[PDB]
C-alpha cells in the first residue's frame, strides 16, 4: 500500500530433536476462553477404584510380611513355562521357629540411574549491586 | 573464528540406524592440537599470574584488597 | 576445624527407598486408632 | 606494671589473629600479663581507632563546656569527645594549670596455622607414605634379586569394601547418540593397550 | 617414581580410593569431579574418564564448565563422533545456553563440515533465540558468501525480532554491497510493515522516525529528491 | 485517614487476641448423631 | 523385645535409622532449618544465580549478625547489598524472638520448681543476663538521646 | 524469495504479514501471536482492600487452612510451634493446638474426615481428631523437615514432602508409607493431590514441577520452564489446572496434558511465597517483598498491585507475605505474614468496571514471554 | 513380579511338574541380592532336587536358564556363546 504511494524512481532434523518451539509457547494466550474441563465422575470413580485396590494390595503386603503375628488381623498357582510345561506352584509351610525369609538381610545398594530420554530445560532470554 | 581464519559427505548405516561422517583426519587432528595448545597457553598464563603468613592467608588479604 | 561442618545438602530419602524393610517391630507402629471417622455427608 | 615495646607488638600481632573477644588467648603469649590487663592496654592505648592527636581550639572549647555540663563523668565526656578518657582528663588539667625468648614464642605461635590434630594428621600421612615406599623399595630389591614378590593390596575395613582397580566402580556409559563411534572406539582401545605395554617395559 | 605396571596399579588404586572417598563424602564439589576425570585421562583410560564425567553430570546436569570439559576431553583425544553425540545431547538438555551451541558450531566449522553448521544454525534460530544467534548466522553466511541465504535469514530474522534495528541491519547489508534495487525494496517493505501494523504499537515514534528518516536520506543520496521529499509527505499524513 | 490510633486506618478492625474463647475440650467438628 | 533382638541377629540392623527431634537435638535441627531458610531466600533473589562459594560466605554473615545481636553490637557490614541485609535482619529477628520466648518459658519453669535439667538452669542464667544487659544498655542510650 | 514475491504483490496492489511471509504454521511468527493476544480483553475483577488484622501468634504465620466444609473457622501454624484456630466471622481466637516442638510448616483439613493434618520442621507428621482436639496418629519416616502435606480428595490417603527430596504417600489408617515418589533433585516446596492421573503434583528447589502416576511410581511429565526454585503452587478449584511460581515468573498448566497454558504478567514482583486461585478466576500471588498481586487467571493480566503495611514495631523485612488461602465462598483472602499478623482482605463492593478499572491491559512485547 | 526362566531340559518331559515358590528364600549367586526361590524335581521319585540359583533379572541380562546357566535359546555356556558370536 504505502510503497505504491511514492512516485517511481527516475535514475539435519536430528539436531536437538527433543526440543521444539511448540513446547515453549503457552497454549491459552491466543484463546483466553479455552476450556480445561474437570474430569467427570466416570473417570474419578474408575481411577479411584483402581488406585484404592493397588494401595490396599501394598498395605496387605507390608502387613503380611511383618513379624507381628497380629498383623494378619488387619490384612484386608499355575504357570506355563517355555509354552510346553504346565507348572503347579505351591509354597510349603515354613518352620515357624526358623527365620521366615532365609535370604533376607540388611544390605545397602547403589541403584543405577539409567534413562534413555533426555529432558529439555525450557527457559527464555551493575554487578557491584550484588 | 579469527584464529581459525588466520591459518588459512554423510550416510546413515541401515544396519545400525547411525549417521557416519567422512571428515578429514588432518582437520580432526588439527582441532585436537589447537585445543591442547590453547589449554596449555591459558594454563601457563594463569601460572605466570600466580607467580607474581601462608599462601591462602595472603590470597585472602589480596581478596580483601580487591574488595576495597 | 574440619570435622565441624555445615549441611550443604540434606540426605535424600530416595536412598532409603532403594532397599526393603527389615522386620523390626516398633512400638509406635503397633495397631491403634484402627477405624477412620467420617463426616456427616 | 609497665608495658614493654615488645609486649605491645606481641599484643597487636595477637589481635590480628584472635580479634578483640579472646583476651585469654592473647594473655597466653604475654607471660607477665593477664587478659584483663591486655584488654585494658588495647582499648586504652593500642587500638588504632583511638585519636591521640592534638586538640583543635574548638575541641578545647567543647571539652571545657562538657566538663561543666557533665561534671567528673569522664567516660561520658570521652565518649562525646570521641577520644580516650585519660587524654580528656589530662587535657582538662593542662587547660586549667631476656625478652627475646617471649618474642620467639610469640612468632612461633602466631605463624603456626595448622593446629594440633591437623599437624598429627600430616605426620600420620608422612608415616603412611614412609611405609608405602618401604614396601615399594623392598619389592624392587627382591625383584633385582630375582624373587618376584607381588604387592599387597590394602585390608578391607568392612566386608563390602571396594577395590577400585577390579571394576569401573559405578560405570555410567554414555547414552548412544545418532553418530557411529566404532572406528574411534577401536582407536582408543589401541591407544590404551599401547600405553599399558609401554609402562610395562619402560616404567 | 613408577617403574612397573604393578606399581602403576598400586598408584592408581591409591588415587582412585582418595578421589572416590572425597566424592562419596561430598558429591557436590564439581571441581573435584573434574580433576578426578582429568586424572583418569592422564591414565589414558577413556572408559573410566567418560564414566566419571557421566556420574558428575548425573549429580548436576546444569553446570556448564563440566559439559565443556567433557566435550573438550573427547575432542582432545580425536574422538569426534563421541563429541558429536555429546554436544547434541548438551544442546538437547540445555537449548537456551548460548555457549553449548557455539561450542558445537565452532568445532563443526573447524572441520569444514559446512552443511551441518548451516543445519545447526537453522535448528537454533527456529527456537526463537536472542539476537546474537541471528547475527552469528548472517555472519556465517557472508563468510561462506551465500548471499541469498543471507536474504532468507534476514527475511526470517525480522519476524523473530521485529524492532527497527533489525530492519536497519537488513538495509545496511543490502546497501553496502551495492544492490540498489534490493535496498529500495527492503526499505519500502519496512515502511509498509510499520504502516500496516500501526495499531499493534510495536515501534516507538522516534523509532518509526528513524526508519523513514534513513529511507529519505538514502533516496536523496540515490539522487531521487522527488521520491524522498514525497515520502515525508505521505509519512506526515499517516503519523500527525 | 491514618493516625497513631489506627495505623491501618479507620475502616480496618485490629484485634489483639491473647485468650482462647472456647474450653480446650470443645470439639471443632461436632460429633455426628444418627 | 526378643523378636527384634533375634531379627537383628539374623537380618542385621536397618541401614536407615531416622533419629527423631528430641530435646537434645532441638537446637541443632533449628539451626539447620534456619540456615536452609536463609539460603533459599538469598539464592532465589540474587540475579546472577552463582551458588557454590557464595552460600558459604553468606551464612557466615548470618552467624556474625547473630553474634552481634547477642553482644548488642550493631551489625553493619560496609558494601552489603540492602535486600540481603534485610533478609539477614529478618531471620535474626525471628531467631531472637524464639530465643527470648524460650528464655521466658524456662525461667517460669525454674521458678515454679518444675523439671529442668542442670545445664538448662545455667543456660537460662546466661540468656537472662544477656537480656538484662541489653535492656539496661537501651535504657542508658535513651537517657542520652 | 521474499523480495520477488513482494514485487509481484506490489504489482497486484495497483493481515498483510501472512501473505508476504510464510511460516509452516501461523503462530510461528511473533506478529501473529502478538496480534491475537492484543485483540483479546481480560475479564474485569473488583479491587481488594484490607478488612481485618489479627495479632496473637508469637512467631511468623507460616500456613493457613480454611474449614473446607462449613467455612466457619480457619487454622494457622507458626514459627512459635503452636497452631491457632480462628473464628472467620469475628476474627477471635477459638482454641490453641500445641503439639509440635518446631515450626508448623503446613496444615490441611480433610473435607471427608474430621481430621486436621499438620507437618513441622521437627520431621513429624501428625493427625488431629477435631472431635476431641487431640493428636491420634503420627506418621514416621521423613529424614528431614517436612514442608508440606496434601490430602487426597477421594482416597483415605495423604501426601507429604520436605527437604529429603521425596513425596511419601501414607495410608491414613495403618500409617504405612505405601508409596515413595523419587525423582526430584532437591527439596520439595509444594505438593497438590488431584482426583485423577496425575494424582500428585509437586514443585521443588530443582526448578521443576512434576506430574506423577502414583501406581507406576513414575512421572507423567516433568515441567522445566521455571528458572528458580518453584516455591509456590495452587490448584484451580473449578478447572483442571495448576498455577506455579518462581521469582518474577507465575505460570499455569493443564493437568490432563502437562501443557503450558498461561504466562502471567509477573515481572518485577520478587520472590512469590504463596499462590491462591479463586473460583471467580482471581489468582493471588503473595510477594516476599510484601506486594499483594492479583491476576485474572485466564488472561494472566495483573489487575492490581497492593502494598502490605507491617505492624508498627516491625523491621522492613517483616513486610513479607508467607502463606495465603481464599475462604470457601471466595470473597475473603486470608494471609499470614512475617509481622506475626493475619490479614483478611475483602473484594470492594463499591467498585464497578467504570468506577475502578484497575491496571490497564497492555502486554509488553519487549518481555518476550508475553 | 516376572515369571521364572527355566529351560525344557531342566524341566524334563513329564506332563506336570510341581514347583515350590519361596519369596526371598535365597541369595543370588551373581548379584548377592535376595530373590524368590523356585525348586522342583523332574518326577516325584527322582532323588535329586533342582533349584533356581540366580534371580530372574540376572538371567534375562545374560539370556540364560536360572537352574543351569546355559543360554536360554542355544543351551550352551556364556563363555562359548560369546566366543562364537
Ligand atoms: Zn541376581
Ligand atoms: Zn536349564
Curated annotation (Swiss-Prot), chain G:
It is found in: Nucleus. The MPN (JAB/Mov34) domain has structural similarity with deubiquitinating enzymes, but lacks the residues that would bind the catalytic metal ion. Contains a region with structural similarity to reverse transcriptase, presenting the classical thumb, fingers and palm architecture, but lacks enzyme activity, since the essential metal-binding residues are not conserved. Present with 468 molecules/cell in log phase SD medium. Component of the U4/U6-U5 tri-snRNP complex composed of the U4, U6 and U5 snRNAs and at least PRP3, PRP4, PRP6, PRP8, PRP18, PRP31, PRP38, SNU13, SNU23, SNU66, SNU114, SPP381, SMB1, SMD1, SMD2, SMD3, SMX2, SMX3, LSM2, LSM3, LSM4, LSM5, LSM6, LSM7, LSM8, BRR2 and DIB1. Functions as a scaffold that mediates the ordered assembly of spliceosomal proteins and snRNAs. Required for association of BRR2 with the spliceosomal U5 snRNP, and the subsequent assembly of the U4/U6-U5 tri-snRNP complex. Functions as a scaffold that positions spliceosomal U2, U5 and U6 snRNAs at splice sites on pre-mRNA substrates, so that splicing can occur. Interacts with both the 5' and the 3' splice site, as well as the branch region. Has a role in branch site-3' splice site selection. Associates with the branch site-3' splice 3'-exon region. Also has a role in cell cycle. This is Pre-mRNA-splicing factor 8. It comes from Saccharomyces cerevisiae (strain ATCC 204508 / S288c) (Baker's yeast). The chain holds residues 725 to 869 of 2413 of the full protein.
